[PDB]
Amino acid sequence: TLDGPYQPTSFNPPINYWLLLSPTNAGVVMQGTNNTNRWLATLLVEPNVESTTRNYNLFGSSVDITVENTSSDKWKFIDVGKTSLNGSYVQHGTLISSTKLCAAMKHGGNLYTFSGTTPNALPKAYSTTNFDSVNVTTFADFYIISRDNEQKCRQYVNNGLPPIQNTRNLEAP
């Protein structure tokens, strides 16, 4: 099989697969909803950004969100979510990254993303509801890595993608 890259698209991902996103610049990286109780997204903020209100298109709506990135050297991924149609988005996990990669996976009713600071970012679970039916729309090129190969996803998120598009076969010893 071919891990990627795949171009921005919308689909409902199966459980037990990581989607590894490779955005180029700040903005919305990906979003997903179950159309019932969760509307979710990951935002990207470049280094060296003082607290500022930015506009993001989430599910077609114009949403103003106050963001900051105090890191001089690393990019900041921000997980955001709301739990009702008219609810406010709030910021949850963050991933402070030199690689500009983030990732999400549905497993066991939970939604996992990477959080922390590279090269020591780790998967962490959101478990406030059953997330199994949440779809995705990606706004960056992305790769698909099975949970059985989670070690490969961890290594890429923390250390970078290979310089060529052969991820199926490229892994550190």
Author numbering: 64 to 236
What does the original paper state about this entry?
The P genotypes are further classified into five genogroups, P[I] to P[V], based on the sequences of the spike protein VP8*, one of the two proteolytic fragments of VP4.
To investigate the structural features of P-VP8*, a recombinant P-VP8* variant (62–232 amino acids) was expressed in E. coli and purified by affinity chromatography with GSH-agarose. The N-terminal GST tag was removed by thrombin cleavage to obtain a purified protein with the molecular weight of ~19 kDa. P-VP8* showed the typical galectin-like fold with two twisted β-sheets consisting of strands A, L, C, D, G, H and M, B, I, J, K, respectively. According to the structural superimposition, P-VP8* most closely resembles the P-VP8*, with a RMSD value of 0.442 Å; it also resembles P - and P-VP8* with RMSD values of 0.483 Å and 0.532 Å, respectively. The RMSD values partly reflect the similarity of the structures although do not have absolute correlation with the phylogenetic analysis of the sequences. Here, it is shown that the structural differences between P-VP8* and P are more pronounced than those of P - and P-VP8*s.
